[PDB]
Design an enzyme around this catalytic site. Sequence first.
Site, PDB file in Angstrom:
ATOM      1  N   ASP A 188      64.658  12.895  58.621  1.00 42.29           N
ATOM      2  CA  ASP A 188      64.947  12.452  57.250  1.00 42.29           C
ATOM      3  C   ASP A 188      66.395  11.973  57.122  1.00 42.29           C
ATOM      4  O   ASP A 188      67.120  12.342  56.192  1.00 42.29           O
ATOM      5  CB  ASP A 188      64.621  13.601  56.270  1.00 42.29           C
ATOM      6  N   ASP A 210      58.431  23.118  51.954  1.00 40.60           N
ATOM      7  CA  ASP A 210      59.176  21.855  51.938  1.00 40.60           C
ATOM      8  C   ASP A 210      60.285  21.851  50.899  1.00 40.60           C
ATOM      9  O   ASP A 210      61.125  20.952  50.895  1.00 40.60           O
ATOM     10  CB  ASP A 210      58.246  20.675  51.645  1.00 40.60           C
TER      11      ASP A 210
HETATM   12  O1  LIG Z   1      58.764  12.664  55.478  1.00 40.39           O
HETATM   13  C1  LIG Z   1      59.294  13.810  54.853  1.00 40.39           C
HETATM   14  C2  LIG Z   1      60.482  13.377  54.004  1.00 40.39           C
HETATM   15  O2  LIG Z   1      60.024  12.465  53.017  1.00 40.39           O
HETATM   16  C3  LIG Z   1      61.056  11.890  52.227  1.00 40.39           C
HETATM   17  O3  LIG Z   1      60.515  10.975  51.259  1.00 40.39           O
HETATM   18  C4  LIG Z   1      60.162   9.709  51.776  1.00 40.39           C
HETATM   19  C5  LIG Z   1      58.634   9.631  51.902  1.00 40.39           C
HETATM   20  O4  LIG Z   1      58.177  10.390  53.005  1.00 40.39           O
HETATM   21  C6  LIG Z   1      58.166   8.196  52.094  1.00 40.39           C
HETATM   22  O5  LIG Z   1      56.755   8.148  52.024  1.00 40.39           O
HETATM   23  C7  LIG Z   1      58.776   7.246  51.067  1.00 40.39           C
HETATM   24  O6  LIG Z   1      58.319   5.932  51.431  1.00 40.39           O
HETATM   25  C8  LIG Z   1      58.529   4.950  50.435  1.00 40.39           C
HETATM   26  C9  LIG Z   1      59.609   3.974  50.915  1.00 40.39           C
HETATM   27  O7  LIG Z   1      60.876   4.596  50.862  1.00 40.39           O
HETATM   28  C10 LIG Z   1      59.633   2.689  50.089  1.00 40.39           C
HETATM   29  O8  LIG Z   1      60.463   1.740  50.713  1.00 40.39           O
HETATM   30  C11 LIG Z   1      58.230   2.103  49.920  1.00 40.39           C
HETATM   31  O9  LIG Z   1      58.316   0.939  49.077  1.00 40.39           O
HETATM   32  C12 LIG Z   1      57.159   0.126  49.126  1.00 40.39           C
HETATM   33  C13 LIG Z   1      56.338   0.332  47.846  1.00 40.39           C
HETATM   34  O10 LIG Z   1      55.640   1.562  47.905  1.00 40.39           O
HETATM   35  C14 LIG Z   1      55.320  -0.780  47.592  1.00 40.39           C
HETATM   36  O11 LIG Z   1      54.873  -0.711  46.251  1.00 40.39           O
HETATM   37  C15 LIG Z   1      55.879  -2.177  47.871  1.00 40.39           C
HETATM   38  O12 LIG Z   1      54.803  -3.090  47.877  1.00 40.39           O
HETATM   39  O13 LIG Z   1      56.509  -2.204  49.139  1.00 40.39           O
HETATM   40  C16 LIG Z   1      57.614  -1.331  49.250  1.00 40.39           C
HETATM   41  C17 LIG Z   1      58.319  -1.610  50.571  1.00 40.39           C
HETATM   42  O14 LIG Z   1      58.860  -2.911  50.515  1.00 40.39           O
HETATM   43  O15 LIG Z   1      57.391   3.088  49.356  1.00 40.39           O
HETATM   44  C18 LIG Z   1      57.198   4.225  50.185  1.00 40.39           C
HETATM   45  C19 LIG Z   1      56.126   5.125  49.568  1.00 40.39           C
HETATM   46  O16 LIG Z   1      56.593   5.678  48.354  1.00 40.39           O
HETATM   47  O17 LIG Z   1      60.189   7.359  51.084  1.00 40.39           O
HETATM   48  C20 LIG Z   1      60.687   8.652  50.791  1.00 40.39           C
HETATM   49  C21 LIG Z   1      62.216   8.609  50.769  1.00 40.39           C
HETATM   50  O18 LIG Z   1      62.660   7.885  49.644  1.00 40.39           O
HETATM   51  C22 LIG Z   1      61.808  12.979  51.454  1.00 40.39           C
HETATM   52  O19 LIG Z   1      62.938  12.423  50.820  1.00 40.39           O
HETATM   53  C23 LIG Z   1      62.255  14.139  52.345  1.00 40.39           C
HETATM   54  O20 LIG Z   1      62.616  15.251  51.543  1.00 40.39           O
HETATM   55  C24 LIG Z   1      61.178  14.575  53.343  1.00 40.39           C
HETATM   56  O21 LIG Z   1      61.789  15.381  54.329  1.00 40.39           O
HETATM   57  O1  BGC Z   2      60.826  24.794  57.929  1.00 37.62           O
HETATM   58  C1  BGC Z   2      61.577  23.956  58.786  1.00 37.62           C
HETATM   59  C2  BGC Z   2      62.815  23.470  58.045  1.00 37.62           C
HETATM   60  O2  BGC Z   2      62.403  22.798  56.867  1.00 37.62           O
HETATM   61  C3  BGC Z   2      63.463  22.169  56.177  1.00 37.62           C
HETATM   62  O3  BGC Z   2      62.934  21.410  55.110  1.00 37.62           O
HETATM   63  C4  BGC Z   2      64.426  23.244  55.671  1.00 37.62           C
HETATM   64  O4  BGC Z   2      65.511  22.653  54.988  1.00 37.62           O
HETATM   65  C5  BGC Z   2      64.927  24.109  56.827  1.00 37.62           C
HETATM   66  O5  BGC Z   2      65.650  25.215  56.329  1.00 37.62           O
HETATM   67  C6  BGC Z   2      63.759  24.615  57.682  1.00 37.62           C
HETATM   68  O6  BGC Z   2      64.271  25.211  58.850  1.00 37.62           O
END
Ligand SMILES: OC[C@H]1O[C@@H](O[C@H]2[C@H](O)[C@@H](O)[C@H](O[C@H]3[C@H](O)[C@@H](O)[C@H](O[C@H]4[C@H](O)[C@@H](O)[C@H](O)O[C@@H]4CO)O[C@@H]3CO)O[C@@H]2CO)[C@H](O)[C@@H](O)[C@@H]1O
Ligand code: BGC
Length: 420
Positions: free
Chosen positions: A136, A359
């Site tokens: 990420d 998560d």
């Molecule tokens: O994987 C765990 C991790 O996830 C993080 O969040 C991510 C999501 O996993 C991911 O699916 C998401 O993807 C987006 C992407 O950023 C956009 O660029 C894309 O845009 C598309 C749109 O959906 C369409 O409508 C259009 O036609 O096209 C565009 C592209 O041009 O959409 C997708 C789906 O929503 O991005 C997330 C990050 O912003 C979390 O942040 C993290 O906590 C997790 O560990």
């Molecule tokens: O569970 C695996 C990992 O998940 C992450 O989203 C958390 O921030 C970490 O603390 C954890 O070790």
Amino acid sequence: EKVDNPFEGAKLYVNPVWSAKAAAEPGGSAVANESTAVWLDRIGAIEGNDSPTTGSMGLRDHLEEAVRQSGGDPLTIQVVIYNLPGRACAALAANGELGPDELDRYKSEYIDPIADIMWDFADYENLRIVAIIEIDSLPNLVTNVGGNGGTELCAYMKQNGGYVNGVGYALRKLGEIPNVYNYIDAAHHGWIGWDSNFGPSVDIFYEAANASGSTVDYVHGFISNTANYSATVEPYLDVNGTVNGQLIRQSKWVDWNQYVDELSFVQDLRQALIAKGFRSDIGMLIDTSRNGWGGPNRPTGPSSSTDLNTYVDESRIDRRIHPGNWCNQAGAGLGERPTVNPAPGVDAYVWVKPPGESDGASEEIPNDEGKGFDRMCDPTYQGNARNGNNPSGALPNAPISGHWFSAQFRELLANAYPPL
Ligand SMILES: OC[C@H]1O[C@@H](O[C@H]2[C@H](O)[C@@H](O)[C@H](O[C@H]3[C@H](O)[C@@H](O)[C@H](O[C@H]4[C@H](O)[C@@H](O)[C@H](O)O[C@@H]4CO)O[C@@H]3CO)O[C@@H]2CO)[C@H](O)[C@@H](O)[C@@H]1O
Ligand SMILES: OC[C@H]1O[C@@H](O)[C@H](O)[C@@H](O)[C@@H]1O
Ligand SMILES: [Ca+2]
């Protein structure tokens, strides 16, 4: 001189800390001997900090336990490098202790002591350390900078080079150790599968591999789907197909994505990366910890419907409301157990995110981990731009990220695919 595929011919590490947690759940013994990756989510996890996320074992403890479990024979342990400055810049659930300006501390107090400990085990010829580099991180600099709906933190992390330089530094420091196998995180198909994101992701991966003294030769491969839920294969869904005229891509679910699953995604990504200049012997990983999508709700075949969205929604095994819904996803099951070379270009299916670890918190929970309340983990949250203004789909009453989440573990277990 490092083996082509570190998972090949090797016993897999069983984390005793994770194993005990799984075994204490009803029916959890069925999966308690599965191999999961060990996360170094804090500087404190290096020496060991008796935390809710890493328990009583530091890195040295884990490597000693890996050596013990090996019995002298090849054994592979996965270690997640996860403490970048401004970590997880697009979200709040897994923000960390190191702020955006602390690259220097990331190098000196995080990567360096990790490298030091790993060097101490270089004399074990049959110990293999798979280092999973910074989940990420880099894809955020493609999809969450500028335009609309990005974050200033991600913009800043791109500007100051902290992600790119931090990754390159990890790659060099760990990659120069003889039994360390580096895999760069590559998001998932429902993140960077689109045309607009795919090529730029390839470019930033290449940039990081060449930053801070690194070259592509420190990169054994890439991992997709880490801590995510995207299907390995959609068995009843063809991205190129059509339902009664209307293209599959025109559906609400696919939404012009180049891909509908992880396998086609990583295989294409592999080819792009090689073309960009990565080694031709790179291999891909897919985190299958939570992507099985089994149980009674799993489609048993393609829909008979002639309406586009009805066919897609009835045929897809990934049952999320939106592919952007990433937190504690309701109805998820355990996926394929760790498997060597299951598909062309794929080194292994692996369990990197340990099943049962949250998560993110579903509400405000006070902590010293640097972690905020991310509303994408709030079941009642009605979404935003990055999820098509949909409900979050996240499980209620979730603890802080990495903390044990009994209800999620139990549902993952129940929904395992293939069945246990
Ligand atoms: O994987 C765990 C991790 O996830 C993080 O969040 C991510 C999501 O996993 C991911 O699916 C998401 O993807 C987006 C992407 O950023 C956009 O660029 C894309 O845009 C598309 C749109 O959906 C369409 O409508 C259009 O036609 O096209 C565009 C592209 O041009 O959409 C997708 C789906 O929503 O991005 C997330 C990050 O912003 C979390 O942040 C993290 O906590 C997790 O560990
Ligand atoms: O569970 C695996 C990992 O998940 C992450 O989203 C958390 O921030 C970490 O603390 C954890 O070790
Ligand atoms: Ca290889």
